[PDB]
A paper describes a structure:
MerTK, a TAM receptor, regulates macrophage efferocytosis and polarization, and its inhibition holds potential for tumor growth suppression and immune modulation. Additionally, MerTK plays a prominent role in regulating efferocytosis, the process by which macrophages engulf and clear apoptotic cells. MerTK is activated upon binding to its ligands, Protein S or growth arrest-specific 6 (GAS6), which recognize phosphatidylserine (PtdSer) exposed on the surface of apoptotic cell debris. In this study, we present a novel strategy for designing MerTK-selective inhibitors by modulating the conformational dynamics of its αC helix.
1 is a furo­[2,3-d]­pyrimidine-based pan-TAM inhibitor. 1 occupies the ATP binding site of each monomer and the binding of 1 induces the DFG out conformation of MerTK. The furo­[2,3-d]­pyrimidine core structure (Ring 4 and Ring 5) of 1 forms a hydrogen bond with M674 in the hinge region. Additionally, there is a C–F···C short contact between the fluorine atom of the benzene ring and the side chain carbon of L714 in the allosteric region. In the structure of MerTK in complex with compound 1, the αC helix adopts two distinct conformations within the kinase dimer: monomer A assumes an’αC-in’ conformation, while monomer B adopts an’αC-out’ conformation.
Residue numbers in the entry:
A (entry chain B): 580 to 622, 631 to 659, 666 to 744, 763 to 863
B (entry chain A): 580 to 596, 599 to 621, 632 to 661, 665 to 742, 763 to 863
The structure:
């Protein structure tokens, strides 16, 4: 999965955190052509066994990992997506000079894309643990792919808040919240509630409120993702068919 | 985007072929701006998508003017005393025009054009007439892409009428060659009618006399026979930016 550092050219920073940075880049490929890539520098064992596991995944709704470079500090190489992240994209759509006003059907498709990507990952028993709109990338064909920047109390399941166990249902809970971000076009979860009040708020039985123009059927699906008992929440494959059927029931 | 005709005063001709004239544009803040006015609902269509663009390397649109004189539409652009890049390059080879352009400045010229093209490529907008003559020099010597030619058309676009963003990349390679050659017409010794045959037999523009091998590599990649093998504007922009940083100041 390793790529020779020679074939990589680094550009300007695209985003910066504290556990690493992400920079644009040029990747020289096998067929001579160059490809625009993103380079997340995570400035190791659990990583080597991970990038190998992820470089073998292949799904259109899962971000594709092009490989890893070794500098003497590892760097992850991913294809550059001009459209950015779904969260920032949603906010832009509420503005006159950005993406056109995203209709209901396009928003639902966004959710379908994510559910497909998560179904694929949960089928291989992979735990994302950081699902959110900010971690979803828009491909060049406007299809959304699941990713994880890695460089969120309101996106964490109730059982994961008190205990520290994470499961496929924890990801499903975060999926419901992501579904709510999309339906709200970028709103922060639980307006009027502080991060420290989140566990108390959830333990008393409170959940995210139904968006303004969100269909009842759509809210039913996302609400199911927040059932107090993880075993009562539906699987990603179940969620994928529910969303796909709802989207089909809507006019083109 | 329309602007009251009474706010525009036309001057002398800056170049013809429609015609472009200098002009004074009274602004909303009371002051007048030195503008360029080009005269010929398909003309308004080109400018429809123009007022949306906002990039320092893309010529900015000031407005559109409909003259009912006797319609006659007119586009208003900011006036650039330094003219077009192609003519500017020729002037550089004369002792009364701008001084000899160093390699770094020539590279920055390409970098500016690449940023402009990258901006419009991300917007899925095809230029289709990219050349040094269609590039304008701003007051701060930065280059901006504009549009006022058989040798600037990609080989896939000569046979068919197909025009992709890779075709713009092909024309970008030719433009890079123009800047490196400081105004030489592409393909010396080759006629316009011989261009398609010339390209079909694997021949490409020749490497300039004082063109660094790295630079020629980048522009050669723009002329690959398969459009899918030509790099994108974003990749090209980084390649030029990296080449420029490696050279001393
Ligand atoms: C106009 N504009 C466009 C972009 C822009 O374009 C981009 N193109 C590509 N990447 C970009 O940033 C990414 C970098 C790395 C990763 N991901 C990894 O490094 C991962 C390693 N693993 C193992 N996984 C994983 C985990 C779990 C799974 F289930 C599946 C995979 C990873 O996701 C994802 C995105 C950007 C940005 C970008 C960069 C910074 C901030 C923002 N806001 C956007 C900025 N501005
Ligand atoms: C000392 N001296 C200075 C100048 C001089 O100064 C100037 N200042 C400003 N403009 C000038 O001429 C222009 C007129 C129109 C346009 N362009 C449009 O009207 C466009 C419509 N569209 C849709 N687009 C488009 C397309 C695709 C995109 F991606 C983006 C935009 C246009 O660009 C561009 C230049 C001149 C000249 C000038 C004028 C004529 C000939 C020459 N040789 C120079 C002469 N002598």
């Amino acid at each position: 999965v390793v790529i020779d550092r020679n074939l990589l050219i680094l550009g300007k920073i695209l985003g910066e955190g504290e556990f690493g940075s992400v920079m644009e880049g040029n990747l020289k490929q096998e067929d001579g052509t160059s490809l625009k890539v993103a380079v997340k520098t995570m400035k190791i064992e659990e990583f080597l066994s991970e990038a190998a596991c992820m470089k073998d995944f292949s799904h259109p709704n899962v971000i594709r990992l092009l490989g890893v470079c070794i500098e003497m500090k590892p760097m992850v190489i991913l294809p550059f997506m001009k459209y950015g992240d779904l969260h920032t994209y949603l906010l832009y759509s509420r503005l006159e000079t950005g993406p056109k006003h995203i209709p209901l059907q396009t928003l639902l498709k966004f959710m379908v894309d994510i559910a497909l990507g998560m179904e694929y990952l949960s089928n291989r028993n992979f735990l994302h643990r950081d699902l959110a709109a900010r971690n979803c990338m828009l491909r060049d064909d406007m299809t959304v792919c699941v990713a994880d920047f890695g460089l969120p109390v309101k996106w964490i399941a109730i059982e994961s808040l008190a205990d520290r166990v994470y499961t496929s249902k924890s990801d499903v809970w975060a999926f419901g919240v992501t579904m709510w971000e999309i339906a709200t076009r970028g709103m922060t979860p639980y307006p009027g509630v502080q991060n420290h009040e989140m566990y108390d708020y959830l333990l008393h039985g409170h959940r995210l409120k139904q968006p303004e123009d969100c269909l009842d059927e759509l809210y039913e699906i996302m609400y199911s993702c927040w059932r107090t008992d993880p075993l009562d929440r539906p699987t990603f494959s179940v969620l994928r068919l529910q969303l796909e059927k709802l989207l089909e029931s809507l006019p083109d």
